Design a protein around this ligand. Structure first.
Ligand SMILES: [Mg+2]
Ligand SMILES: [Mg+2]
Length: 52
RNA sequence: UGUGACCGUUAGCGCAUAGUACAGUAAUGGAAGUGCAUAAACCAAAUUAAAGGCUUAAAUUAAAAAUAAAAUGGCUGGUGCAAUGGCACAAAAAAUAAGAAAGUUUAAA
C-alpha cells in the first residue's frame, strides 16, 4: 500500500536485470572485469534464462 | 543415469524403513527385527553279554535287479547360499556472482 507511480516504474525497470541467464549459456573471459560497456563474459546464441 | 580386487542382516546408513517402540518434565537420546537347512554350550535317557557231534559221489544258473547303524529326543539360530537394502565418487542437469543505482552494454543470420 505504500507505493506510488515512481515505485511501480522502478520495480519494472529493474526486473529484467534480476532475471539471470543459464551458466551453461555463458562463457567467461580471462581476467575481464565489469566496466563501461564491457562484461566479463560473452553469450552463446539464443541464451535461455534460469529454470527456477 | 553410469562404474567398483566397496558391504551382504552383530556387515553396509541409526533404519533390507524407524527417527518408529521405548527412556526423559523438557531440549535430547535411541533399539530389536529377511528367506531356507541334523552347529556349540546346555538338561533327561542309554552299564554289563551267554551257546560244543545228522550217516555226504552226479546240484543251480533267459538276462538283469534285489540282505550290513558313520548321525537319540530337545532348546537355540551360528555357519553356508541369494538379494526389491546400503557406501564412494563419476556423467548430465540444477543452484550461484556482478561495475552502476529511478537510465542505455551481450544482438548469430
Ligand atoms: Mg544370517
Ligand atoms: Mg544393521
Amino acid at each position: 500500500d505504500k507505493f506510488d507511480t515512481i515505485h511501480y516504474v522502478t520495480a519494472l525497470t529493474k526486473l529484467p536485470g534480476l532475471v539471470h541467464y543459464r551458466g551453461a549459456d555463458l562463457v567467461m573471459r580471462d581476467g575481464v572485469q565489469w566496466s563501461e560497456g564491457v562484461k566479463p563474459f560473452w553469450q552463446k546464441p539464443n541464451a535461455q534464462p534460469r529454470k527456477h
